[PDB]
Nucleic acid binder design. Structure first.
Lengths: 1027, 87
RNA sequence: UAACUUUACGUUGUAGCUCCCUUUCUCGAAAGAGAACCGUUGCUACAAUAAGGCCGUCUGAAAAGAUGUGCCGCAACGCUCUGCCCCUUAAAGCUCGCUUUAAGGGGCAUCGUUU
């Protein structure tokens, strides 16, 4: 119904959108709607870790501890059921009673004295529990321990631990995040076998074969590493032949398929172009993998023999394809000693295919000798059953392979090959595929952009064209972004230094030397006191003179659109009056190689111009078309993918065929500067600038610059419409241009009358779709998350507000020194700790770098004080470690709002309460602790529930607040609200702390759409359960 | 319906694993987990020969134990699925 | 990218040995010492190492509590299934504008997939 162009500005934390109505010639005539959507970037803002790292670490730790506990339990079961254990020694849900507390001394004394049955289970359990290692410090420690074992009398690792290991540093097991006291699992096998042999030598009715077998199984039990999905590891069927099972990713034909598929689309990149392998190149690279294993990026290059002019679609060194099955079979044959080191494998492809199928379908010796006995020689079966194991299944059957492989060898492409042998448009964009987008931030940004596009298409209709502009910070890693920020800061500092240098030459220049004269003077400095084109010299009178020097483009704008920083040069008063839209190749007689060209080349050859600008002195018949096309578009992965996806997967009611225009960055700044347009609302400004850069505006701009390039104006730059810089500013900020002290209009009536008053000459400034901009934020209504803080505290003194926590000395400060649990029971220790602390002015790292010693009464010393347990306040917490520890509460996940007597009460709900299913009943009361909180009963009406980032509104007796709820303080009962656009002039950094919810006249939570429209109140019906 | 270490892969198929999507979550999760664990264990029940530290009899001892564990796991999974009433 | 076998830590509780230690008991040479119920420095051992959910088996009637050579439990994406909210049209009636049921479109999840 409405013809319009939709402009998008996509960042890593926001997406601005605008719609510009166009005529039949793609010319802006109106500004219909605009808006901004804000979210949180899909990464940790503090460091840059992915959003799913803590979850992965916690899952790994959980699995590790579960496996260790299960292994110890199985060891106990084996020691009870398969030997002498006297199962009256095992009581309740408990363990071996009266277990000795010194396995380490026992394990080193089992070769000179019999061990009691009560002293055998201890050493066995200790060996199973700490079973050693199977990344530099750990390897160095185990290597040093191995070297130490084979030097002195250290027949057992336990003897090493007892003799030289503990008497030096006073400990046996490692402390802190260090790596010295680690052992290898092979050494533990050696010690275990020595223990069993030399202890059966002395006696003991134990040490049967079952004990040895069980302990050796438990000691060398490690789960095999998982890889890939689980559906891929199953025997399915064929997509083309529904009568034969799949094939393994080990057979000759399947790996031939993989190799041909990878080789066909190599796409050797010649200086940025598309240079595929021809028939003669693919006839040689085909057989290289099958002959050598590590075929890397450069390994093919030597066969290609190029001269750095052909890249690939050092650091670029990765195996493009590897022979897994072939070299695995070759090694299995070689290690038995029945094949030379380097020779072709004397086996038909059918034989390797059949052994691969058998090895991937059956995993027992009997079955593998049940299917390979009649096909391979007697030695081959045994040689294969010693170093060979295969897995995984491809989705292509064996029968179809015999047809697919020959065609791909003939050069036919995959798709046409399988077609000969054997993406429709929609209204809304489909979900962004995560296969190609291997980045979380980019995926989240594109998902939000797709949501905005779907919403606007739903509200208005199919857009004619989409103009995408992405900030330079998108599609980049965190380190590159930080480098960009530091480079920008350094550039700003250098600009300030250059400005300070400028303020010396001509103080009389007005009262504010700006950056334009700075650029003029800097470019003058580049010429090194010389002039260009004209050939005259420096010592001109006044640097500005209003006409003496004019910044001009060397290559004309009308043909290049290449402002950049290289093209612009500064000339003198003479010359340049009859240049025109001529490149220097057609103006200085360079085509005929005259003096007018060589002289100026010599003059500029001593300049300080950059390499790109220095080699842009001359352009030998450059492409006068693609160049202006290259500066008007974007050549990055994200922009190209967006263009392709929105071009194919949805409908755009345009006119041409390339109805997606990804614009550049410099062109946007040029347009915004030319047209007048100079908080978190400026995103829509670039959106409007971007959606008005149609090809018709480009045509008019080219005509204007070409006319003005000849000095033929014997008028300002063309604009989309008259009064452009005013209407856009009024629509965005609701205030007149450049007036941060003016009042803001946040209502339809106020904005409409402001538009009618300040733009009475434009009848199109008002329409039925004008609404003050409202920034929208991404909701977060997850009820999952952390259960409590990592640290846990003793809960013995929990009747009061007390909790004991052991802190190291190096971390303790003077603030917690006055809260030590034992403050009055040892006076001298506290005084010494204060004296050490009150020396370096609360510097614990530099004060406790020396050992601490509890000095005995009347002198002498005693044992170290490495850590001290201090006392902290604790009014509430979470019971963990099986009612043995108390932990701090987790992040707030829900608030329940109740109303009674024109008063509002907040009931906090945490994650652990959701997990246990115990919904709370106590509303927060300021001052009093939880035990004195107002209990909730049937007399309290329930209004709604608040999650983080939810639209709320309060009406207090002083003013009215409308914002996004962020956090609720349980100590006061006051909620915090962020202003919609996060204005720095309202509150502290856009937030309104300490809002008084209680005694408020009105309080209700609002609902907002994804485009910032449809702001309506919501009345929740009944309290939802936690689970 | 019996599961044996010889005819095992003919039953542990993608079709059999995907037939479980109809069951309610309280039943769907455990049998699917059992099937996945058994399939992975069978698929990785021979890397003990690829590692040179599991020398001599330990290698096929681990292989036999892993195969028995996998076949018992899928026997339990298929018994639970049979109780839930699928074919 | 996204994930995967482990290992060494940290914290809490109990037990053993060990240093300081504030009261209260036990005394003729004034000094101290000894035994205890508590605090607590260090070493070792053991248990727990998110809070917790599913499924199978045991004692059984109010319910457990254990048990398992099994998976999930701080994330991302999405709407086929389930829920909340908002918006249209319909059957209506309110009391003189809110609900009951709906069909459809969305947003978010306690829902689905990957882990």
């Amino acid at each position: 119904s409405i013809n319009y162009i939709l402009g998008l500005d996509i960042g890593i934390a926001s997406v601005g959108w605008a719609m510009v109505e166009i005529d039949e010639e793609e010319n802006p005539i109106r500004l219909i709607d605009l808006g901004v959507r804000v979210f949180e970037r899909a990464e940790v803002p503090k460091t840059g870790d992915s959003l799913a790292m803590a979850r992965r670490l916690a899952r790994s730790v959980r699995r590790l501890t579960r496996r260790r506990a299960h292994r110890l339990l199985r060891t106990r079961r084996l020691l009870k059921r398969e030997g002498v254990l006297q199962a009256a020694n095992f009581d309740e849900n408990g363990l071996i009673k009266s277990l000795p507390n010194t396995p380490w001394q026992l394990r080193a004394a089992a070769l000179d004295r019999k061990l009691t049955p009560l002293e055998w289970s201890a050493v066995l359990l200790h060996l199973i529990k700490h079973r050693g290692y199977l990344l530099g410090a750990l390897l160095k420690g185990v290597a040093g321990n191995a070297h130490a074992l084979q030097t002195g009398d250290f027949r057992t690792p336990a003897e090493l631990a007892l003799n030289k290991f503990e008497k030096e540093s006073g400990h046996i097991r490692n402390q802190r995040s260090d790596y010295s006291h680690t052992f290898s699992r092979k050494d533990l096998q050696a010690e275990l076998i020595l223990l069993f042999e030399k202890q059966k030598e002395f006696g003991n009715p134990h040490v049967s074969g079952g004990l040895k077998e069980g302990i050796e199984t438990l000691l060398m039990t490690q789960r095999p590493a998982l890889s890939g999905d689980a559906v891929q590891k199953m025997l399915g069927h064929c997509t083309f032949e529904p009568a034969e099972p799949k094939a393994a990713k080990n057979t000759y034909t399947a790996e031939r398929f993989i190799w041909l598929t990878k080789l066909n689309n190599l796409r050797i990149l010649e200086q940025g172009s598309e240079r595929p392998l021809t028939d003669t190149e693919r006839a040689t690279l085909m057989d290289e993998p099958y002959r050598k294993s590590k075929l890397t990026y450069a390994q093919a290059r030597k066969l290609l023999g190029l001269e750095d002019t052909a890249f690939f679609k050092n650091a670029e060194a990765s195996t493009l394809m590897e022979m897994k099955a072939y070299h695995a079979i070759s090694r299995a044959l070689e290690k038995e000693g029945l094949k030379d080191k380097k020779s072709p494998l004397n086996l038909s492809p059918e034989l390797q295919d059949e052994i691969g199928t058998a090895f991937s379908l059956f995993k027992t010796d009997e079955d593998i000798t049940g299917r390979l006995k009649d096909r391979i020689q007697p030695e081959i079966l045994e040689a294969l059953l010693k170093h060979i194991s295969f897995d995984k299944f491809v989705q292509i059957s064996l029968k179809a392979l015999r047809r697919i492989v020959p065609l791909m060898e003939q050069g036919k492409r995959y798709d046409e090959a399988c077609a000969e042998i054997y993406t429709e448009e929609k209204i809304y964009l489909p979900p962004i595929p995560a296969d190609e987008i291997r980045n979380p931030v980019v995926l989240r940004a594109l998902s939000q952009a797709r949501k905005v596009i779907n919403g606007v298409v739903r509200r208005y209709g199919s857009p004619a064209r989409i103009h995408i502009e992405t900030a330079r910070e998108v599609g980049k890693s965190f380190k590159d972004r930080k480098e960009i920020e530091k480079r920008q800061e350094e550039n700003r500092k250098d600009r300030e230094k250059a400005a300070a240098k400028f303020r010396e030459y001509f103080p009389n220049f007005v009262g504010e030397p700006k950056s334009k004269d700075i650029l003029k003077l800097r470019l003058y400095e580049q010429q090194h006191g010389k002039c260009l084109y004209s050939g005259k010299e420096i010592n001109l009178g006044r640097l500005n003179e209003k006409g003496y020097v004019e910044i001009d483009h060397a290559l004309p704008f009308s043909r290049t659109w290449d402002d950049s920083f290289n093209n612009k040069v500064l000339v003198l008063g003479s010359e340049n009056q009859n240049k025109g839209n001529q490149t220097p190749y057609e103006y200085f007689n360079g085509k005929d190689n005259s003096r007018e060209w060589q002289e100026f080349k010599a003059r500029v050859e001593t300049s300080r111009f950059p390499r790109s600008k220095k080699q842009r002195i001359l352009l030998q018949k450059f492409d006068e078309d693609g160049f202006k096309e290259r500066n008007l578009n974007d050549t990055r992965y994200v922009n190209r993918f967006l263009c392709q996806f929105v071009a194919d997967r949805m409908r755009l009611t345009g006119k041409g065929k390339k109805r997606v225009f990804a614009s550049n960055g410099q062109i946007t700044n040029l347009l915004r500067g030319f047209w007048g347009l100079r908080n978190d609302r400026h995103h829509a400004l670039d959106a409007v600038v971007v959606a008005c850069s149609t090809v018709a505006m480009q045509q008019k701009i080219t005509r204007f610059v070409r006319y003005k390039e000849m000095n033929a104006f014997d008028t300002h730059f063309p604009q989309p419409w008259e009064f452009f810089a005013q209407e856009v500013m009024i629509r965005v900020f609701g205030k007149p241009d450049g007036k941060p002290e003016f009042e803001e209009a946040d209502t339809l009536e106020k904005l409409r009358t402001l538009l009618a008053e300040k733009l009475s000459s434009r009848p199109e400034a008002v329409h039925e779709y004008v609404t003050p901009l409202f920034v929208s934020r991404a909701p977060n209504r997850k009820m999952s998350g952390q259960g409590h803080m990592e640290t846990v505290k003793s809960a013995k003194r929990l009747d009061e507000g007390v909790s004991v926590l052991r802190v190291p000395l190096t971390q303790l400060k003077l603030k917690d020194l006055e809260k030590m649990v034992n403050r009055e029971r040892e006076p001298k220790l506290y005084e010494a700790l204060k004296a050490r602390l009150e020396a370096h002015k609360d510097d614990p790292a530099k004060a406790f770098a020396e050992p601490f010693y509890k000095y005995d009464k009347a002198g002498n010393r005693t044992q170290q004080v490495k850590a001290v347990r201090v006392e902290q306040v604790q009014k509430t917490g979470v019971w963990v470690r099986n009612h043995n520890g108390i932990a701090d509460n987790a992040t707030m996940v829900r608030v329940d709002v109740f109303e009674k007597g024109d008063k509002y009460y907040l009931v906090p709900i945490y994650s652990w309460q959701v997990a246990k299913g115990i919904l709370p009943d106590r509303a927060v009361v300021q001052g009093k602790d939880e035990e004195d909180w107002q209990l909730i009963d049937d007399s309290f009406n329930f209004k709604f529930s608040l999650h983080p980032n939810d639209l709320v509104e309060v009406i207090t007796k002083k003013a009215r607040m409308f914002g996004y709820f962020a956090s609720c303080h349980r100590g006061t009962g006051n909620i915090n609200i962020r202003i919609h656009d996060l204005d720095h002039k309202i509150g502290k950094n856009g937030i309104l702390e300490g809002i008084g919810v209680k005694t408020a006249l009105s309080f209700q939570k609002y609902q907002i759409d994804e485009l910032g429209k449809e702001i309506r109140p919501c009345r929740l019906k009944k309290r939802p359960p936690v689970r | 319906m019996k599961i044996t270490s010889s005819n095992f892969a003919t039953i542990a198929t993608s079709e059999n694993f995907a037939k479980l999507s109809v069951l309610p979550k309280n039943h769907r999760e455990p049998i699917k987990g059992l099937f996945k664990s058994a399939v992975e264990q069978f698929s990785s029940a021979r890397d003990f020969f690829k590692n040179e530290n599991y020398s001599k009899e330990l290698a096929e001892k681990f292989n036999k134990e892993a195969v028995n564990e996998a076949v018992e796991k899928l026997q339990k999974a298929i018994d639970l699925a049979e109780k839930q009433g699928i074919q």
